[PDB]
Short mmCIF file of C-alpha atoms and ligand atoms in Angstrom, two decimals:
data_model
loop_
_atom_site.label_atom_id
_atom_site.label_comp_id
_atom_site.label_asym_id
_atom_site.label_seq_id
_atom_site.Cartn_x
_atom_site.Cartn_y
_atom_site.Cartn_z
CA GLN H 1 21.53 -16.92 -25.21
CA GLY H 2 22.35 -18.08 -28.73
CA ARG H 3 22.27 -14.93 -30.85
CA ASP H 4 22.56 -15.82 -34.54
CA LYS H 5 21.23 -14.73 -37.94
CA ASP H 6 20.54 -11.18 -36.71
CA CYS H 7 17.99 -9.73 -39.12
CA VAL H 8 17.28 -6.33 -37.52
CA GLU H 9 19.96 -4.44 -35.65
CA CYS H 10 18.54 -1.44 -33.77
CA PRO H 11 14.74 -1.86 -33.70
CA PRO H 12 14.29 1.87 -32.88
CA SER H 13 15.59 2.58 -36.39
CA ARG H 14 12.03 1.70 -37.49
CA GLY H 15 10.66 4.77 -35.70
CA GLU H 16 9.87 8.12 -37.28
CA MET H 17 10.24 11.86 -36.80
CA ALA H 18 7.13 13.84 -35.88
CA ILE H 19 5.95 17.02 -34.20
CA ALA H 20 5.71 16.53 -30.43
CA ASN H 21 2.50 18.39 -29.47
CA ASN H 22 2.71 17.09 -25.89
CA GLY H 23 1.07 20.33 -24.67
CA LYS H 24 4.65 21.48 -24.11
CA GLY H 25 6.13 24.88 -24.89
CA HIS H 26 6.40 26.23 -28.43
CA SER H 27 8.81 28.85 -29.85
CA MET H 28 12.21 27.89 -31.30
CA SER H 29 14.27 30.16 -29.04
CA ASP H 30 13.60 28.98 -25.48
CA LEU H 31 16.44 27.38 -23.53
CA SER H 32 14.39 24.16 -23.48
CA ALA H 33 14.22 24.01 -27.28
CA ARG H 34 17.76 25.20 -28.04
CA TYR H 35 19.26 22.70 -25.59
CA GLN H 36 17.17 19.86 -27.02
CA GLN H 37 18.22 20.64 -30.59
CA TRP H 38 21.92 20.72 -29.64
CA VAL H 39 21.81 17.35 -27.88
CA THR H 40 19.61 15.57 -30.43
CA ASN H 41 20.40 17.43 -33.69
CA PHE H 42 16.65 17.19 -34.36
CA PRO H 43 15.03 20.30 -35.87
CA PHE H 44 12.50 21.87 -33.53
CA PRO H 45 9.84 20.78 -32.82
CA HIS H 46 10.50 17.28 -34.15
CA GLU H 47 11.16 14.31 -31.89
CA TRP H 48 11.46 10.52 -32.31
CA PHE H 49 8.43 8.23 -31.99
CA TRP H 50 9.22 4.54 -31.55
CA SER H 51 7.64 1.69 -29.56
CA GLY H 52 4.70 3.96 -28.74
CA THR H 53 6.76 6.46 -26.73
CA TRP H 54 8.44 9.80 -27.40
CA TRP H 55 12.22 10.21 -27.54
CA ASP H 56 14.01 13.52 -27.98
CA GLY H 57 16.65 12.06 -30.30
CA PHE H 58 18.10 8.87 -31.76
CA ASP H 59 21.80 8.29 -32.49
CA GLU H 60 21.33 5.54 -35.07
CA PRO H 61 25.05 4.69 -35.63
CA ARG H 62 25.37 4.14 -31.86
CA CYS H 63 21.80 2.77 -31.54
CA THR H 64 21.33 5.08 -28.55
CA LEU H 65 18.10 6.94 -27.88
CA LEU H 66 18.55 10.47 -26.55
CA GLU H 67 16.59 12.65 -24.15
CA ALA H 68 17.51 16.21 -23.13
CA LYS H 69 16.36 18.09 -20.01
CA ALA H 70 17.07 21.81 -19.66
CA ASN H 71 15.40 23.91 -16.95
CA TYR H 72 14.61 21.86 -13.84
CA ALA H 73 16.85 23.16 -11.02
CA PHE H 74 14.12 25.50 -9.75
CA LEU H 75 12.27 22.46 -8.34
CA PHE H 76 15.27 21.40 -6.22
CA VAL H 77 16.93 23.10 -3.29
CA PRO H 78 20.53 23.70 -4.40
CA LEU H 79 22.71 23.06 -1.36
CA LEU H 80 20.85 19.96 -0.12
CA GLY H 81 20.50 17.99 -3.36
CA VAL H 82 16.84 17.16 -2.72
CA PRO H 83 13.75 18.39 -4.59
CA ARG H 84 11.39 20.91 -3.10
CA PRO H 85 8.58 18.84 -1.50
CA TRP H 86 5.92 20.77 -3.43
CA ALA H 87 7.46 19.70 -6.76
CA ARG H 88 7.56 15.93 -6.18
CA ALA H 89 4.73 15.27 -8.65
CA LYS H 90 6.42 17.27 -11.43
CA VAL H 91 9.79 15.63 -10.71
CA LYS H 92 8.19 12.17 -10.71
CA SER H 93 6.44 12.51 -14.07
CA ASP H 94 8.92 14.65 -16.02
CA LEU H 95 12.21 13.23 -14.74
CA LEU H 96 11.81 9.87 -12.96
CA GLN H 97 8.98 7.69 -14.28
CA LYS H 98 9.47 8.98 -17.83
CA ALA H 99 13.02 7.61 -17.64
CA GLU H 100 11.68 4.36 -16.20
CA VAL H 101 9.45 4.00 -19.26
CA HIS H 102 12.39 4.84 -21.54
CA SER H 103 14.43 2.06 -19.92
CA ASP H 104 11.63 -0.51 -20.20
CA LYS H 105 11.02 0.16 -23.90
CA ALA H 106 14.69 0.45 -24.97
CA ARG H 107 15.18 -3.27 -25.59
CA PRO H 108 17.00 -5.49 -26.39
CA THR H 109 20.16 -4.29 -24.62
CA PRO H 110 22.52 -4.65 -26.44
CA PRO H 111 22.21 -2.96 -28.88
CA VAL H 112 19.49 -0.52 -27.78
CA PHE H 113 20.69 2.01 -25.20
CA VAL H 114 19.21 5.26 -23.90
CA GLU H 115 20.93 8.39 -22.56
CA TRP H 116 19.59 11.37 -20.62
CA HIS H 117 21.56 14.61 -20.97
CA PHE H 118 21.07 17.32 -18.34
CA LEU H 119 22.01 20.96 -18.84
CA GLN H 120 22.24 21.51 -15.06
CA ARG H 121 24.60 19.61 -12.77
CA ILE H 122 22.25 19.79 -9.78
CA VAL H 123 19.49 18.11 -11.78
CA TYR H 124 21.93 15.52 -13.14
CA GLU H 125 23.23 14.44 -9.73
CA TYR H 126 19.75 13.82 -8.34
CA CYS H 127 18.33 11.94 -11.33
CA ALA H 128 21.42 9.82 -12.05
CA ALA H 129 21.39 8.49 -8.49
CA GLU H 130 17.64 7.82 -8.77
CA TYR H 131 18.18 5.76 -11.93
CA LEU H 132 20.87 3.74 -10.16
CA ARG H 133 18.41 3.11 -7.34
CA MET H 134 15.80 1.88 -9.84
CA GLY H 135 18.46 -0.21 -11.57
CA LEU H 136 18.06 1.25 -15.08
CA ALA H 137 21.17 -0.45 -16.44
CA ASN H 138 20.48 0.46 -20.08
CA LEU H 139 20.06 4.17 -19.20
CA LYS H 140 23.02 6.51 -18.71
CA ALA H 141 22.78 10.07 -17.38
CA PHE H 142 25.19 12.88 -18.26
CA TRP H 143 25.81 16.48 -17.26
CA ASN H 144 26.19 17.87 -20.80
CA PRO H 145 25.97 21.67 -20.68
CA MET H 146 25.58 23.71 -23.86
CA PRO H 147 28.13 26.28 -25.05
CA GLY H 148 26.88 29.74 -24.13
CA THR H 149 25.14 28.81 -20.88
CA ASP H 150 26.42 29.72 -17.44
CA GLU H 151 26.24 25.99 -16.66
CA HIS H 152 28.86 25.39 -19.35
CA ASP H 153 31.14 28.00 -17.77
CA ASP H 154 31.03 26.02 -14.51
CA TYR H 155 31.69 22.71 -16.29
CA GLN H 156 34.89 23.74 -18.08
CA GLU H 157 36.03 25.29 -14.80
CA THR H 158 36.24 21.91 -13.08
CA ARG H 159 37.31 19.86 -16.12
CA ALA H 160 40.17 22.35 -16.62
CA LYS H 161 40.99 22.38 -12.88
CA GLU H 162 40.71 18.61 -12.43
CA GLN H 163 43.85 18.25 -14.56
CA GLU H 164 45.53 20.37 -11.87
CA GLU H 165 44.29 18.04 -9.10
CA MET H 166 44.78 14.77 -11.01
CA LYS H 167 48.44 15.45 -11.85
CA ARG H 168 50.29 16.59 -8.73
CA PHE H 169 48.62 13.84 -6.67
CA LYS W 5 22.38 22.84 8.53
CA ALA W 6 24.32 19.62 7.87
CA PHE W 7 21.71 16.89 7.44
CA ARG W 8 21.96 13.77 5.28
CA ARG W 9 19.66 12.42 2.59
CA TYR W 10 17.71 9.32 3.62
CA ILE W 11 15.53 6.77 1.81
CA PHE W 12 12.18 5.51 3.10
CA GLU W 13 10.49 3.24 0.55
CA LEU W 14 8.19 0.30 1.17
CA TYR W 15 7.41 -2.16 -1.62
CA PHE W 16 4.06 -3.91 -1.92
CA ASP W 17 2.83 -6.92 -3.89
CA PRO W 18 2.26 -5.52 -7.40
CA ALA W 19 -0.05 -8.36 -8.45
CA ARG W 20 -2.86 -7.68 -5.96
CA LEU W 21 -2.16 -4.01 -5.23
CA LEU W 22 -3.79 -3.25 -8.59
CA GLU W 23 -6.92 -5.12 -7.49
CA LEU W 24 -7.80 -2.20 -5.21
CA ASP W 25 -10.01 0.33 -6.98
CA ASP W 26 -9.74 4.09 -6.52
CA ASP W 27 -12.10 3.92 -3.53
CA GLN W 28 -10.19 1.55 -1.25
CA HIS W 29 -6.90 3.06 -2.47
CA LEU W 30 -7.86 6.48 -1.09
CA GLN W 31 -9.03 4.96 2.19
CA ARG W 32 -5.63 3.40 2.93
CA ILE W 33 -3.77 6.64 2.21
CA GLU W 34 -6.38 8.41 4.35
CA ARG W 35 -5.76 5.99 7.22
CA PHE W 36 -2.00 6.46 6.76
CA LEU W 37 -2.02 10.26 6.98
CA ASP W 38 -4.32 9.95 9.99
CA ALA W 39 -1.59 7.73 11.46
CA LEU W 40 1.16 10.22 10.54
CA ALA W 41 -0.38 13.25 12.24
CA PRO W 42 0.19 12.31 15.94
CA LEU W 43 3.95 11.95 15.32
CA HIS W 44 4.86 15.58 14.61
CA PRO W 45 2.93 18.80 13.89
CA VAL W 46 4.55 19.02 10.44
CA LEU W 47 2.80 15.75 9.51
CA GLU W 48 -0.64 17.10 10.45
CA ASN W 49 -1.55 18.85 7.18
CA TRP W 50 -1.03 17.58 3.64
CA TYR W 51 -1.54 19.30 0.30
CA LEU W 52 -1.71 18.52 -3.38
CA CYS W 53 1.51 19.06 -5.27
CA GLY W 54 1.78 21.65 -8.02
CA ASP W 55 3.95 23.09 -10.74
CA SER W 56 4.50 26.08 -8.43
CA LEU W 57 4.61 26.63 -4.69
CA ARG W 58 1.61 28.93 -5.15
CA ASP W 59 -0.21 26.04 -6.82
CA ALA W 60 0.85 23.39 -4.28
CA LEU W 61 -0.57 25.39 -1.33
CA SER W 62 -4.06 25.76 -2.83
CA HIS W 63 -5.51 22.35 -1.83
CA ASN W 64 -5.28 21.37 1.83
CA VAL W 65 -6.52 17.77 1.80
CA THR W 66 -6.34 17.25 5.57
CA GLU W 67 -8.70 20.18 6.07
CA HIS W 68 -10.74 19.13 3.00
CA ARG W 69 -10.60 15.35 2.57
CA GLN W 70 -13.05 15.57 -0.35
CA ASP W 71 -10.10 16.69 -2.52
CA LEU W 72 -7.99 13.63 -1.70
CA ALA W 73 -9.50 11.93 -4.75
CA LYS W 74 -7.97 14.72 -6.85
CA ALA W 75 -4.48 13.49 -5.93
CA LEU W 76 -4.98 9.96 -7.28
CA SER W 77 -4.56 9.62 -11.05
CA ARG W 78 -5.57 6.29 -12.57
CA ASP W 79 -4.95 4.81 -16.02
CA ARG W 80 -7.96 2.82 -17.18
CA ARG W 81 -5.97 0.61 -19.57
CA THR W 82 -3.22 -0.65 -17.25
CA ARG W 83 -5.23 -0.06 -14.04
CA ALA W 84 -2.22 1.61 -12.42
CA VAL W 85 -2.66 4.38 -9.85
CA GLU W 86 -0.37 7.02 -8.38
CA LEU W 87 -0.90 9.61 -5.66
CA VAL W 88 1.50 12.39 -4.63
CA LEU W 89 1.08 14.70 -1.63
CA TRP W 90 3.44 16.96 0.31
CA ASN W 91 3.91 18.56 3.71
CA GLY W 92 3.02 22.14 2.91
CA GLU W 93 6.43 23.02 4.37
CA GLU W 94 8.77 24.36 1.70
CA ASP W 95 12.11 23.93 3.49
CA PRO W 96 13.45 20.36 3.81
CA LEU W 97 15.48 21.54 6.82
CA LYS W 98 12.27 22.41 8.71
CA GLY W 99 10.63 19.05 7.98
CA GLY W 100 9.45 19.59 4.40
CA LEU W 101 8.62 16.22 2.89
CA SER W 102 6.50 14.75 0.09
CA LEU W 103 4.57 11.48 -0.13
CA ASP W 104 4.89 9.34 -3.28
CA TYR W 105 2.48 6.41 -3.59
CA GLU W 106 2.36 4.44 -6.84
CA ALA W 107 0.75 1.08 -7.61
CA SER W 108 1.88 0.15 -11.11
CA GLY W 109 1.88 -3.39 -12.47
CA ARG W 110 5.63 -3.70 -11.86
CA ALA W 111 7.25 -4.35 -8.49
CA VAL W 112 9.79 -1.57 -9.06
CA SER W 113 7.00 1.05 -9.19
CA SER W 114 4.63 -0.44 -6.58
CA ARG W 115 5.97 1.55 -3.64
CA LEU W 116 5.39 4.22 -1.02
CA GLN W 117 8.26 6.65 -0.47
CA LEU W 118 8.80 9.73 1.69
CA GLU W 119 11.08 12.18 -0.12
CA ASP W 120 13.34 13.12 1.41
CA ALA W 121 13.44 11.09 4.64
CA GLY W 122 16.37 13.19 5.90
CA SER W 123 13.91 15.98 6.71
CA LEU W 124 12.30 13.82 9.41
CA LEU W 125 15.73 13.40 11.02
CA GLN W 126 15.97 17.17 11.52
CA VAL W 127 12.77 17.20 13.58
CA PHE W 128 12.09 13.88 15.31
CA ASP W 129 13.16 13.87 18.96
CA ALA W 130 13.54 10.08 19.18
CA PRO W 131 13.94 9.07 15.51
CA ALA W 132 13.86 5.31 16.11
CA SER W 133 10.59 5.36 18.06
CA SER W 134 8.90 7.65 15.53
CA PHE W 135 10.27 5.87 12.45
CA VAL W 136 9.08 2.42 13.53
CA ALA W 137 5.67 3.91 14.38
CA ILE W 138 5.04 4.76 10.72
CA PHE W 139 6.44 1.36 9.77
CA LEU W 140 3.95 -0.56 11.94
CA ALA W 141 1.37 1.82 10.48
CA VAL W 142 2.07 1.04 6.79
CA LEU W 143 1.98 -2.67 7.54
CA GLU W 144 -1.35 -2.51 9.38
CA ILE W 145 -3.17 -0.70 6.57
CA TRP W 146 -1.37 -2.44 3.65
CA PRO W 147 -1.19 -6.23 4.15
CA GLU W 148 0.43 -6.53 0.69
CA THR W 149 3.72 -5.07 1.98
CA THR W 150 6.56 -7.22 0.63
CA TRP W 151 9.57 -5.19 1.80
CA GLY W 152 10.63 -2.04 3.59
CA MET W 153 13.80 -0.17 4.38
CA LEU W 154 15.19 3.09 5.78
CA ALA W 155 18.79 3.99 4.96
CA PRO W 156 20.89 6.97 3.82
CA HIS W 157 21.13 7.96 0.18
CA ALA W 158 24.92 7.72 -0.13
CA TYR W 159 24.90 4.23 1.39
CA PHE W 160 22.39 2.41 -0.82
CA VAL W 161 23.31 4.14 -4.08
CA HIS W 162 27.09 3.71 -3.72
CA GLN W 163 28.08 1.46 -0.78
CA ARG W 164 25.35 -1.19 -0.74
CA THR W 165 26.68 -4.60 0.22
CA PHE W 166 25.22 -6.43 -2.80
CA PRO W 167 24.55 -4.11 -5.79
CA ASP W 168 22.24 -6.53 -7.64
CA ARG W 169 19.48 -6.40 -5.00
CA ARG W 170 17.98 -4.29 -2.21
CA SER W 171 18.98 -3.81 1.44
CA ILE W 172 17.60 -3.66 4.97
CA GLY W 173 19.11 -0.27 5.86
CA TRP W 174 18.67 1.18 9.33
CA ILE W 175 15.14 -0.18 9.79
CA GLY W 176 13.60 -2.61 7.33
CA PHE W 177 10.75 -5.12 7.23
CA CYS W 178 11.21 -8.67 5.87
CA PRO W 179 7.99 -10.63 5.26
CA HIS W 180 9.04 -13.64 7.34
CA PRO W 181 10.05 -14.50 10.92
CA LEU W 182 13.74 -14.45 11.86
CA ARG W 183 16.08 -15.92 14.46
CA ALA W 184 17.84 -13.50 16.79
CA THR W 185 21.31 -15.09 16.75
CA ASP W 186 21.34 -15.17 12.93
CA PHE W 187 21.89 -11.39 13.10
CA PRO W 188 24.55 -9.13 14.71
CA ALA W 189 24.47 -8.16 18.38
CA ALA W 190 22.59 -4.84 18.57
CA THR W 191 20.13 -5.48 15.72
CA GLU W 192 16.69 -5.63 17.31
CA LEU W 193 13.94 -7.93 16.01
CA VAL W 194 10.30 -7.03 16.62
CA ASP W 195 8.31 -10.02 15.37
CA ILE W 196 4.91 -8.82 14.18
CA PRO W 197 2.36 -11.68 13.94
CA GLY W 198 1.32 -12.70 10.45
CA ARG W 199 3.45 -10.72 8.00
CA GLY W 200 7.03 -11.17 9.20
CA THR W 201 9.32 -9.07 11.39
CA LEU W 202 10.86 -5.61 11.42
CA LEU W 203 14.63 -5.31 11.85
CA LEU W 204 16.19 -2.28 13.56
CA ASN W 205 19.97 -1.75 13.33
CA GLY W 206 20.83 0.23 16.45
CA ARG W 207 18.44 2.85 17.84
CA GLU W 208 20.84 5.63 16.84
CA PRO W 209 20.59 6.92 13.25
CA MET W 210 22.97 5.29 10.79
CA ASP W 211 26.18 7.08 9.84
CA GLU W 212 27.85 5.92 6.62
CA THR W 213 31.16 7.30 7.97
CA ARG W 214 31.20 5.05 11.07
CA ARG W 215 32.71 1.63 10.38
CA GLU W 216 30.49 0.14 13.12
CA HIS W 217 27.21 1.27 11.56
CA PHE W 218 28.70 0.11 8.25
CA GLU W 219 29.32 -3.46 9.40
CA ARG W 220 26.00 -3.88 11.23
CA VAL W 221 23.93 -3.40 8.07
CA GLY W 222 26.61 -5.13 6.01
CA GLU W 223 26.78 -8.29 8.13
CA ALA W 224 22.98 -8.03 8.21
CA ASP W 225 22.26 -8.14 4.47
CA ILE W 226 24.75 -11.02 4.24
CA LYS W 227 22.47 -12.98 6.57
CA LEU W 228 19.28 -11.65 4.93
CA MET W 229 20.52 -13.17 1.66
CA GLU W 230 21.73 -16.38 3.31
CA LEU W 231 18.11 -17.25 4.12
CA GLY W 232 16.84 -16.12 0.71
CA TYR W 233 15.03 -13.05 2.06
CA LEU W 234 16.71 -10.14 0.27
CA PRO W 235 14.57 -9.52 -2.84
CA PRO W 236 16.08 -8.51 -6.19
CA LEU W 237 16.51 -4.86 -7.12
CA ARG W 238 14.55 -5.26 -10.38
CA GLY W 239 11.36 -6.78 -9.00
MG1 LIG D 301 11.56 19.52 -21.69
#
């Protein structure tokens, strides 16, 4: 409480772009890379390094740090909304505790926020509820499918047929 | 089948949970899986997780306990540990369930969780008797247990009584003794000596659609906070 003579808005603006090299996957054409570049507008394979951690993108005018997640539905069972028990370790590290670290390092809030954009709805619904359970208030999850995917065809189906259900009601 | 997602996390004291090295850490998990086996055949064998189902079925750690150390990853700098195992059963409907044990420096990540606890509902004959059995387990092997709770996923995430802090759920453990009349009618107290009591909210499994089961846990957590027992959500 107090908040005056603000010298540095958006501390993550003092980060830098760099090649990831997290023993990930290379090639510029995979769905993982193309989806990341569309969410972050970062040229592959560059990401954002600030506060000792890796971030997929950084919307400086909004002071929001971005992270994109493409192919992860194959570790969940579709109809039940739970992960496959054999994939708990991969879900924990890649999706859950990595977002917990993102929330802890994205400070102060305001103005530093962090968003996680999921290509797949099934992955979004699980993770977003997990973040609410962990109380990551400065972290927002979105189902943001890319044009050209079959996930995008399902998204515009319901956002064009929700204006037929939220109108006659 | 039409099952429901359920949460089963138990929080432990993050300050002195880190004091355990990788030796005593493995022994408590070992004593916990030994406790889990006599409850259902699906809890008899546990495996290492993997990036593929083919990979996650390669290391039976119940048959070969020497590979239990391979599950526990430890950071030397922060002295945090984590250990993830799973049932070996692929289908959550048939009892498939993983075990997530992490002891980080923060109270939010010093927990043991069974994911997803709704799989145990599709297989336990008497769920209340079997669910408290693994409660009283956890608390015997881990004296640092600060809190526990079992509740559905839709209830905590969306319909929790107080959103700023945790809940008692269907069955939870509060680290203190409680009075019986401070709670609703059919909420059963089993006072364990030394570490608190365990609170059961009706021996039948909670249903978030029944207004009764809603009010029992609701009117509960109102009491639990009246005495200063409900801990915050963030630590
Ligand atoms: Mg990725």
